[PDB]
Structure formats: C-alpha cells, structure tokens
Amino acid sequence: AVKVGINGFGRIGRNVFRAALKNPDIEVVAVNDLTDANTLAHLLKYDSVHGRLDAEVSVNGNNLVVNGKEIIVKAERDPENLAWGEIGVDIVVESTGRFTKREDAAKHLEAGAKKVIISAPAKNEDITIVMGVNQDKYDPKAHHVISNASCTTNCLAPFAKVLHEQFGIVRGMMTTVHSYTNDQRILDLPHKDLRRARAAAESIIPTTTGAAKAVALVLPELKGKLNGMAMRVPTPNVSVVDLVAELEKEVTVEEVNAALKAAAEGELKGILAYSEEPLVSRDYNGSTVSSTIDALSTMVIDGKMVKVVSWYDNETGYSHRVVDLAAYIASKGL
Template identity: 55%
Template sequence: MAFSSSLTRSAPSPVQDTFRFTDRSKVSCGLNSNANAVKFQSSIFGTNVSVDSSSLQKVMCRSIKPIRATATEIPPTVTKSHSSGKTKIGINGFGRIGRLVLRIATFRDDIDVVAVNDPFIDATYMAYMFKYDSTHGPYKGTIKVVDESTLEINGKQIKVSSKRDPAEIPWGDYGAEYVVESSGVFTTIDKASAHKKGGAKKVIISAPSADAPMFVVGVNESTYKPSMDVVSNASCTTNCLAPLAKVVHEEFGILEGLMTTVHATTATQKTVDGPSMKDWRGGRGAGQNIIPSSTGAAKAVGKVLPELNGKLTGMAFRVPTPNVSVVDLTCRLDKSASYEDVKAAIKYASEGPLKGILGYTDEDVVSNDFVGDSRSSIFDAKAGIGLRAVLE
C-alpha cells in the first residue's frame, strides 16, 4: 500500500515550513523544505540540531523510544510463538483476505489452520480459488480435495464447512482456538462472539469494528488484554497510516491532518455500472472511473493512537488498479522539522523498532513494485515535498 502525507510545521521559530510526506506500498513519506539557507534550532529526537546539520549529525542524535512490534507475516524480524504447540486457527469467509491468510499461514511453522468455513463455496471451488490468484500468482505448494469436507495443502488436512450461522460452526471439534472473521459480515462484538458458541476462544475481525477493541501491529498491540475475546485488526488503510503517524507524532507532534487515500479496487465495486443504493458513485464501473468515496481510516487512527483522536480526517478515491494503494497525509507539526529530519526519523524506525512493519524507500518505484510486500506501510522518500517555507 502506498501513502503520501503532507505536513505543516507550526512551532516557536522564525520560520514556518509546510511539508508533504508520501508513503508507498503501505506507507511512504517524503518531505521537502525551501528554508535550507535559514538557520534555526530544531529539536530532533530530543537533541538540538541546526537545519543545515549533516545527515550524519542528525543520525547520531536519534533517540526514538523503542516501539515493541511483531509483524504479521514472515519478515526476518517476526517474533514467533514460543509455545510448545502451534497456534490453531479457523478462517470464516474465504474471500480475498481469507485466502491470503491461509496462503501466508501455510508458510509459517508456528501457525496451523485447521478449518475454513464459507457458506457459498464448496471444497472443490475452494481449492481452485486458493490455487490460482490473478494478483499474486499460482500457489507455490500443493493442494488437493480429499472429500467434500476436507482439503489437503502441502500434505496437511484442513476441514471445510459451509455454515451460514457462525454459532453453528464446530470450531471446537476442529481444534480451532482462534478464528479469523474475514467474511465482512460479523464485524461487531455481538455478532463475532457467535463463533465462541462453536468452541472458539478468541476472534480476530479482519475489518474495522464499531465496538471491538482495534489494534494495529507496531502501534498499540501492547495494550491488548487477555480478557479481550473479540478484537479488530482495523483496515488496510489504517494499518498503513498508523505506523507513519505514530513515528511522526512522537518525534514532531501532529496538530491536525487531512488524509487522502488513492485506493485500489475492492470486491464490493461493480465491473460495469450497476445499482448501489447506499453509494451511487460507488456503483459506477470500477475499471472506467476514478470514484470519490468515504473512508474512516483517518478517524480510526485516533482509536489506536488516542493522542491523535479528533486530529485527523480523510477521504478516498477508488482507482482502476487491482492492488496497492496510496495515502496522502497533509498535517501541521508542532515542532520544527526539515525534510531531512522527517526522513531520518522514518528511516530509523524502519530499520529498528518497526522493521518488518514500516518500510522506507528512496528509489524510483511505482505501486506495482509493492505487490506481495508483507510490510504494513512503506515510506516513499522521493514522493514527499515541502509545501512552503515562509519567514514570519
């Protein structure tokens, strides 16, 4: 996913800069300043450094607070489970998210998917949809149908069911302790809790929720409590924006911000013009139009970063691409900061505390270069600009 963000710094200084940051492949951020010739003291990671200080001087002054984070796929930085057995998982809803969760899980040695439920797909069609993917290519493993209730992937059998009511799915019989709720239907605590009636202990909703605790890896997972049985993993856009916003806010302070996401096509859109009573523009042909839409991603950041609650808002544009999106964040900063300051902060976090979650690139990349990237957010250093630098 790609993000672009613009920041305006407002601080006690003779110079006021407006910066723009861009994030790619999940998050990218860039910043440009026109005040390089003007000297003033800037608080960078707790140390005063002048604007024209060298990059090395700035790097030596970094002291970002450690951020404990565990990526969700398989980068080398992933902290895997230390329990004696594998984590037993069930998947409800075999759409884009459900299938990709299963793909990723088959290459993890600490996770064991034991069952998949989808009321609209039988085992044979499940195998076909899992094996072939127009975006990520064919599955690099083996899959076969054992019978109408069993798939075998890489020699491991997975039970298949087709229950419409989540309370009727026998997760306990399958041995599933955790359920990934990826149907897009049961997104509240009450609805998702129905999985517990079938024997599940915990439920992870793969979408934003109106009332379930929301977590973004690398941002607020440390606030999780064992008593929370149903949680939300937020949205793809929130997972892209939140790590970037966290680093920028902790180092420079975000006073307010506007996010715009240029978002890839999703499954709910129409291939040609069709009825969409709740969102008329959303019913127009996805491959033919740039479609303005709403998004709750910016406000959701306030749920995972309470200190930013009420400070961010945003909108979306749906575009005719199958994968990878961009987020553009324009915001005012509380502390003085140059373009190099912000890049240094993001680069440091991407190589240390948030490695495997927040990325950094200064190459001439485009969206397709990030297909299959496991990181939540990638900062595009070349895509950011400074909007203005004005002497007061």
C-alpha cells in the same frame, strides 16, 4: 501450534492462508465459505493478483489437502453452526465482511472458539489493534473480539505515530488512492454508496474512509486531529496513503525522512519500510510490510506543513498482520 479457522475464504481469507503457510507457530485447520471444496481448491491454487500458490493443493472428499495436511471445508452461512470447539480451533479469523458487529462476531466464541480477529473496523469489539502500534494494550484476560482495523489504518498509523512522537501533529488530512475491491461493482449496479455503485475499472471513484479517524483508536493523542477520504481507481491491488500534516516543530524534508528511516530500521522494522527508489504500484504487489514510505515524495512547506506518501499491498501486508496478531495473541496465552 495455535489452531486457526478462517471464516470467509475470499481475498483476505486466502491471503491469510498464504501468509500462514510461512508461520510455523500457526496452523490453519479449517475454512468456511459459501461454496464447495473444488471451487476453493481452484481459487486457492490460481490467483489473478498473486500467481500460483507454491504448494500442492488437492481435494480429499470434502476437504482441502495442502502439502499433505487436510483442512476442513465448511459451508455454513450462520456462524453459530460452525462448531469451532469440536475441531479444536482456538482463533477464528472473521473475514467474510458480514460479521463485523460484536453481536455477529461473538457467535464464534459461543461456537467454541477462544478468540476472534475481525479483518476490518468493528462495532463494539473488545479492542482494535494495529501491530507495531498498540499490541501492548491487549489483555488476554479481557479481549476476545479483536479488530485488526482496516488496511488503510494499518498503513497510516505506524508513520503517524513516528511523526507525532517526533514532531507532533497539530492536524492532518489524508487521501488513500486505493485499488478496487470486491465491495464495488463491475457495471453500474445498486450500492448503498452511489459512488461505489459505478463501474470499478472505468473511473476514479471518490468514497468515504473512516481510516483517518480510526487512527485515534490506536493512537489516542490524535483523537480529532485527522480526517481523510479515499479514491478507488482501476488497479486490482496495491494502494497508497497521501498524508498532509501541520507539525508543531519546524522540520526539513531531510529530517522527516531521517526519522522515518530510523523507525523502519528500528522499532518498526517489518511493519514500516522506507524506500528511496522511484517505484510504482505494481512494484509493491506481494509486499508484506504495512507501510513503505516513498521517500522521494516527502515534501515540506514553511517548515511546518509536510506531505508523506506511503505504499501498501492492501491484501498482503494486511494478511501478514492478521497472522502476526494471531501469533502474538496465542503468545499471550490462550
């Protein structure tokens, strides 16, 4: 029903597409990138990480035909010339990675879109939402440039929430051991981040993350209580959050895991998951939840310091959240 347009048909853009084909509440009517339709059809069809799209994809002139519906292909470098309004696009998913500051993202609104979901942390957005955490704070009257935060924040927030509500976080530090992404380099090339300049598939690469601090945007009570870093490693998809926290109450592993399982089975079902199996990163490829607790890794010291580890498919989970947010937003009235 709600008409969606995707700006930047890359890892997240094409994964959102894939997640959207499942949602009957949403309809992707157009995509914009920097290439032609033949190239997009080919990239959409064959995915190195996710396998063949199971849908008939063809090219009809300048457009994509997927299961008989035509999808408009644009190739406009400048968001202002998109003309979203002319084709009836209501919600734009901004997934280029170039327009995360309000000045650029709002161009879509000026082009006739009713709402914009930035697929990353933003600057000056109306509101930053983590589904299952603070979607209730969205005001349809006032919020038009919406950030869906990062994949890492989507992983950490749901369980930080649980731990905080339940035991109370004094302070905590995280490490995300993260698959490489298109922001890195194949072989030692210039980068703003000198760590991210280095061959992506050959090293463990420390890099900064704003994800722990960003939790404070969706869970105000944690402002100034978490910090963290990332470690980019030689895998193409799937990541994991390692959080070490000092709690207010004294707990046991059993207690910590019970609260997490409860939430995964209740309030956070479909967002937070819980696993007691000894799995590895490849096992989570294709996982649509935001966070899956590795129960076997939970660990406590002195009743107060806990280690919690949670898996996330950084392309899939995050893309399903983008679609969830689009439906929720549309559900509040456009």
